Write a structure and sequence with these properties.
The complex is a heterohexamer, with 2 copies of chain A (218 residues), 2 copies of chain B (211 residues) and 2 copies of chain C (390 residues).
Chain A (H helix, E strand, L loop, with lengths): L2 E4 L3 E3 L5 E8 L9 E7 L6 E6 L5 E3 L7 E6 L4 E6 L8 E8 L4 E4 L3 E5 L8 E5 L11 E10 L4 E5 L9 E2 L3 E3 L2 E11 L10 E6 L4 E6 L3
Parallel strand pairs in A: 2-11
Antiparallel strand pairs in A: 1-3, 3-8, 4-5, 4-9, 5-6, 7-8, 9-10, 9-11, 12-13, 13-17, 14-18, 15-17, 16-17, 18-19
Chain B lengths: L4 E3 L2 E4 L5 E6 L9 E5 L6 E5 L3 E2 L7 E6 L2 E6 L8 E9 L2 E4 L3 E5 L9 E3 L3 H6 L1 E11 L4 E7 L3 E2 L3 E5 L9 E10 H6 L3 E7 L6 E5 L2
Parallel strand pairs in B: 2-11
Antiparallel strand pairs in B: 1-3, 3-8, 4-5, 4-9, 5-6, 7-8, 9-10, 9-11, 12-13, 13-17, 14-15, 14-18, 16-17, 18-19
Chain C lengths: L8 E5 L6 E7 L3 E5 L6 E3 L3 E4 L4 E18 L17 E10 L9 E20 L6 E9 L4 E6 L6 E5 L3 E9 L8 E2 L2 E2 L2 E2 L2 E2 H4 L6 E2 L16 E6 L4 E5 L4 H7 L13 E3 L3 E7 L19 E7 L5 E7 L6 E2 L2 E4 L10 E2 L5 E2 L6 E8 L3 E7 L6 E7 L4
Parallel strand pairs in C: 1-3
Antiparallel strand pairs in C: 2-21, 3-4, 4-9, 5-9, 5-20, 6-8, 6-17, 7-8, 9-10, 11-12, 12-21, 13-16, 14-15, 18-19, 22-23, 23-28, 24-27, 25-29, 26-28, 29-30
The chains are: A mainly beta (218), B mainly beta (211), C mainly beta (390).
Membrane topology (chains C, D): Multi-pass membrane protein
Protein name (chains C, D): Envelope protein E
Organism (chains C, D): Zika virus (isolate ZIKV/Human/Cambodia/FSS13025/2010)
Chain lengths: 218, 211, 390, 390, 211, 218
């Protein structure tokens, strides 16, 4: 089972060069049966192919981007690299690395969001959301976790180290009038076990390398 | 270059239905065409290759047929996890190009938002700010609105909303609205309230509290 | 003296009228024809020959090819086409091949590929048809004793009049026997060799073949029997000839018997005919001589033949020749009443010189009898006993 | 003397404190500012200028094309492909054509045909955006009578301190009025000509256009607006450019008004501002002179202005200069109390020579009053009647 | 060259049935294929061109469909006049080539041969010869046999038969057998007879008579 | 409505040249939309295309016959000609002229049978077949017409100048052991009109130009 993983989501200044590396796990990149490609996706809808490359080194680029793209293989480290140059705001997108089997992409990566602006990275501040005065209710309680004032996107939020999946809803971040997006994450659990079961929201802001865990207690 | 077309663009179906999605290439690609599935916040997943071959580990529900220019993806017995936008994809002349995508939403029965409200935590009051969070949970349709009362005074600014996608299990929506005050204005007033109007609520449900 | 030791010998006798006599002729056999006051002449049917065989099929066992070429296409670019595939002289092969970026295509898929090569035959073997119109029977007729003529007889020409010097002529009329001739074989030739082969096996030889004789330019069939197409690249395919197959036929021809064809005609063994022969114009010498008068002498003692007859060789020490030879058999010896009969009927010594030799063949009666040669006091006798009965 | 005949003239008075005074400025208008013991200085707002406009779109009205090529294919041979179709600079067209034996195909059917040509723009027209950050207001302040400074004011720089020689300085603070400025127009340029056009009409011009300024190399959109492909040859297709479209735009621009752009900055008319101006550091001459003593004489008889004020021109026949000018109005004359007020407040003759002229502007009371110039026995008077009431 | 294949080769159907005939080209001819109809003793009649277009004046019963290499001619509601062998035909690389042909016979109920016999006319007796004609009319199946009696003496030589095709109206067969004697042999005997055995005849029908 | 008619069915000697002319009726030959072809059919029953030609003169031949075929147009006489040379017995067939509408043959001719042997033509002898002694029957009578001893094929047989079509059966000719094929024609008519109505069998042997009519009476 091949896995592909792009390097961390990052921030880029206009007219500078975007540099991503995706590293292959579960299999070898030094194979003759497959190609190795890069595919982008601007937020709206579009899926756009950037280029593919052979383990030998042979490149194949989209004609709409050839003058700005450079793709390279490092068979020794089982990874390949994307380089876009003269980047603008039109290049902000999630970039996927994929294995091209024939004319088709059979395996993808988790994706890496690249934002392009002349602004610096800021880490988030994480705040607990617990039941308030008159916390009591019938048989359901809602616990929350407020990720606020970060730039750029994204954070990822898990509960109890990813063990609590059922009642979790994490909401897409909203751009407030300072930059510095802010989202919130909420879970639904029985109120009978409000004190005999712990709850931790794990916030991870990769571009600022921020890692933080919050208890959620009344 | 070959520009692919996909029909329809959006479509809302219900569990158990049999859905068909079509894709058109301007030039003959005979059978060298694929279908991908992209769930929210996830990468595309190859469903069909060769325009009729099912990919290993993909449910039997999905199938594909077509040759030449008109290809068709069929979903027997739609399931609530099938929420995604589906893309057709073909190669030609050393050029990859994908279709525009067919968004597929799920229709189910009406649900009521289990409204909650959350007061600003002490860490926020200290730092400098105050964020109040009204929370709508597991409703449908998406059409719902919120009203922010500060001592029964309908303030409008400083509010921003964020919606989830349809859940993979119950196909419901969720809503978070946030009122953002400076600490001084939060300490001035005392009663904070949010009103939730929705088609499943016979009258606007309210949640509120005091310090 | 002919037909003496032939095992398959037949004795035909003359009618009262004296024209019609039936015979049946075997190859490697003889028929002695005796008629009242007649030269007693022997017919043989010695040779069966075939000629002018129409060629049925011609197989090739050694091939060569030239101007090899290929045509390719990427997927969605159509079928490959070389000008020489509709050309009947060339052998071609069409297949799909895995195409991709590594082979100069903007697609990954099965691409059309065709490959053609001109097939020419270096050495061929030929099958010929053996029909009644090709036959030629050589029959020899000989005065039992210029005096032996040979005649040739076709099924499209059954008659022939053999001419014997002073004896007139014999008239042969024949007809081919039904069932005792060939039709289930062909005259397979191969690099100046020749064989006879079962045409049924001949129609199933896995080699290229054309159906006529060498017409305009031969259109060969089943060219893939000698030409196979080795593995196929994206843009090329390799064509190879097997080479000479002469040894494969020489080993498939295990029990076949050879013939001989010193020219355009092919001679072989067997043959069976049946003939009415007309002896109305066959005569014993038109002059009546007197008897030989001098003394005879037994050189060869009388010796029995396979058929109960006996042969005697005398040497006549007289000059009377041409004189008729007094030869008979007698059981009385007071009177010379003839018994049995002569096979060398009316023996004549045409030799005028002193010590002429002559062979006789007598048909003795059953029991005891005396071979009597000569006429007068110095005549010779020899006892002879023949066993059996009617 | 400025603002005398301006129809859109306004009179602002000074507060008791004497720092804050509010004004509103119109282009082609004036505001006379009077304050207690102050130079009474005139503000105008004469010029509105725009500069450094970010270009929005650039439309092409004259095209040229080169390296035209076509690719064809018979039926069952796939789609036609030229290297130039994926190239964004070239404009292409793909169609089917009737193919057959007459066009070099082994069958009769619709075959693929593509034709491409490189599109280059010879002459372009440009649209520019007019935003508040591009504005530049030129306001002139003048001592009513070195003594007239001009200042420039940006929306990103509302303040400016106009310096007047012996009078100190005036401090302008302003802010752009809401609704009385432009946002719904662009600065269309066309072969050194310039216009103002409704940006909504601008987005619907049927011509090729690119969306940025002249970046790397412009990617033109809707190239078929100037390039059509003539019907259909079997193996070719004929491509034609429409040519110059300048006349089409000059006629589509029927009611548009022209501007002037003598450099990179663009001149136009209207403008509206509001300003608090600080006069704390504005002073009448820091020296107190004595009064002019010699005789005055009316050159221009008193003449009423549009706003009820009156203007008088005298020539002082004395040398006392610099001396203050004794000028007032009086209804008593015996003696001699002031009525109304002067607009040319604290008139001074700096001229040291003999026959200096000077213009005054008085604000007479309603009814009858006497204009009084001079001080002593040789002083001059002139009756004046003003009509109306409060 | 492209060798076309056709399936089936022979087929017997009945009036009102729906018949399908298939044709197979080794190479892609997309839609450039035709279907022809050839009744006995007549030229081919173009039915379909373009692989799906009806030619003017062709009954609505006939239709065609297909693309690429496998094409199919369909006959709705077969009619007794539809007796013919049908050929597919395509052109490629300046070479016309037709299919092998699908023979289509008609199946109907059993019929009895209305046997007749005809004696030699006087013109034949005079000239030199004598031909006797036993005559079968409008039976089915084709399987039927005749026996020639000359004074109740079954002679075998000198007879040869000839069959018609299925009629266009009643789909029946017809049979003519001719006995050929020299005049001397015809004047020797007197009673001439033919016996017709057939599945529709409960016993061998016989016709005869004498000079 | 275009009609095509090949020249008469004929006999040809081995190794000599076969020459046919088909003349076009009901329409033009100097037209740009059509080609003009020749198609053969050996008995039993394969259709083989021989070649097509343009009104201009451009020829297109089958590669299996190209060296033996010559086709020509005469636009002035609205006809075209086929010439096969070095003919053998393998060339005995019915030859059709047809109008090629670019990719298909939309119109055909009646066909012309060409026989190849070293034998001369002989005309037929036509004999009537009427009811014999005991001519009487229930309500049906069978009349006949015996065409005998011709070579080569074909004859055509009609009744009452083609007006009597219903009960007519003409039988395929049989090769007897002399060459000289022989067929017979039969019709079925009511005995009410027999013989209160006339019946004539029209025999036409084109290769011998034989034309003959026989009454058929008791």
């Amino acid at each position: 089972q091949v896995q592909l993983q792009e390097s961390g989501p990052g921030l880029v200044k206009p007219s500078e060069t975007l540099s991503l590396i995706c590293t292959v796990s579960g299999g070898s990149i030094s194979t003759r049966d497959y190609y190795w490609g890069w595919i982008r996706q601007t937020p709206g809808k579009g899926l756009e192919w950037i280029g593919s490359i052979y383990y030998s080194g042979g490149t194949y680029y989209s004609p709409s981007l050839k003058s700005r793209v450079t793709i390279s293989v490092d068979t020794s480290k089982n990874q390949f690299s994307l380089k876009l140059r003269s980047v603008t705001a039109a290049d902000t997108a999630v970039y996927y690395c994929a294995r091209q089997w024939g004319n088709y992409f059979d395996h993808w990566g988790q994706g890496s969001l690249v934002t392009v602006s002349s602004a610096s990275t800021k880490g988030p501040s994480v705040f607990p959301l617990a039941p308030s005065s008159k916390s009591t209710s019938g048989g359901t309680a809602a616990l929350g976790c407020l990720v606020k004032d970060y730039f750029p996107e994204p954070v990822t939020v898990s509960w109890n180290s990813g063990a609590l999946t059922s009642g979790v809803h994490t909401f897409p971040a909203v751009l407030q009038s300072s930059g510095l997006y802010s989202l919130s994450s909420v879970v639904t659990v029985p109120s009978s076990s409000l004190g005999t079961q712990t709850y931790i929201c794990n916030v991870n802001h990769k571009p600022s390398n921020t890692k933080v865990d919050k208890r959620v207690e009344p | 270059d070959i520009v692919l077309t996909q029909s329809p663009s959006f479509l809302s179906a219900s569990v158990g239905d049999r859905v068909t999605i079509t894709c058109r290439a301007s030039q003959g690609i005979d059978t060298y065409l694929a279908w991908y599935q992209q769930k929210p916040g996830k990468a595309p997943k190859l469903l069909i290759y060769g325009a009729s071959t099912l990919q290993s580990g993909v449910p039997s529900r999905f199938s594909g047929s077509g040759s030449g220019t008109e290809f068709t993806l069929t979903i027997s017995s739609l399931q609530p996890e099938d929420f995604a936008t589906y893309y057709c994809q073909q190669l030609n002349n050393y050029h990859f190009t994908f279709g525009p995508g067919t968004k597929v939403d799920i229709k189910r029965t009406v649900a009521a938002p289990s409204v909650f409200i959350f007061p600003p935590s002490d860490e926020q009051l200290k730092s400098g700010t105050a964020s109040v969070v009204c929370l709508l949970n597991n409703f449908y349709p998406r059409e719902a609105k919120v009203q922010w009362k500060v001592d029964n005074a309908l303030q409008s600014g400083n509010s921003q909303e964020s919606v989830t996608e349809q859940d993979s299990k119950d196909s419901t929506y969720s809503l978070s609205s946030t009122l953002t005050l400076s600490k001084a204005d939060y300490e001035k007033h005392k009663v904070y309230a949010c009103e939730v109007t929705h088609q499943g609520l016979s009258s606007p449900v309210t949640k509120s509290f005091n310090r | 003296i002919r037909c003496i030791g032939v095992s398959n010998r037949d004795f035909v006798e003359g009618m009262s009228g004296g024209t019609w006599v039936d015979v049946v002729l075997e190859h490697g056999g003889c028929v002695t024809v005796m008629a009242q006051d007649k030269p007693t002449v022997d017919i043989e049917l010695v040779t069966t020959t075939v000629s002018n065989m129409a060629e049925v099929r011609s197989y090739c066992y050694e091939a060569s090819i030239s101007d090899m070429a290929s045509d390719s296409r990427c997927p969605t670019q159509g079928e490959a086409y070389l000008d020489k595939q509709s050309d009947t002289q060339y052998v071609c092969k069409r297949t799909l091949v895995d195409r991709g970026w590594g082979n100069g295509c903007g697609l990954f898929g099965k691409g059309s590929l065709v490959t053609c090569a001109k097939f020419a035959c270096s050495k061929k073997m030929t099958g010929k048809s053996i029909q009644p119109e090709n036959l030629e029977y050589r029959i020899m007729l000989s005065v039992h004793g210029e005096n032996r003529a040979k005649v040739e007889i076709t099924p499209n020409s059954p008659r022939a009049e053999a001419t014997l010097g002073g004896f007139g002529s014999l008239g042969l009329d024949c007809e081919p026997r039904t069932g005792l001739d060939f039709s289930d074989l062909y005259y397979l030739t191969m690099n100046n060799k020749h064989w006879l082969v079962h045409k049924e096996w001949f129609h199933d030889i896995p080699l290229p073949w054309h159906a006529g004789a060498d017409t305009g330019t031969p259109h060969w069939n089943n060219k893939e029997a000698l030409v196979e197409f080795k593995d196929a690249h994206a843009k090329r395919q390799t064509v190879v000839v097997l080479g000479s197959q002469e040894g494969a036929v020489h080993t498939a021809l295990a029990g076949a018997l050879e013939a001989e064809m010193d020219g355009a005609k092919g001679r072989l063994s067997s043959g069976h005919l049946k003939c009415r022969l007309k002896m109305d114009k066959l005569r014993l010498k038109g002059v009546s001589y007197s008897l030989c008068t001098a003394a005879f002498t037994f050189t060869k003692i009388p010796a029995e033949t396979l058929h109960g007859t006996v042969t005697v060789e005398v040497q006549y020490a007289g000059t009377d020749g041409p004189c008729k030879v007094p030869a008979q058999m007698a059981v009385d010896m007071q009177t010379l009443t003839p018994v049995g009969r002569l096979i060398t009927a009316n023996p004549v010594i045409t030799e005028s010189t002193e010590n002429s030799k002559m062979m006789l063949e007598l048909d003795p009666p059953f029991g005891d009898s005396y071979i009597v040669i000569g006429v007068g006091e110095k005549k010779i006798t020899h006892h002879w006993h023949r066993s059996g009965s009617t």
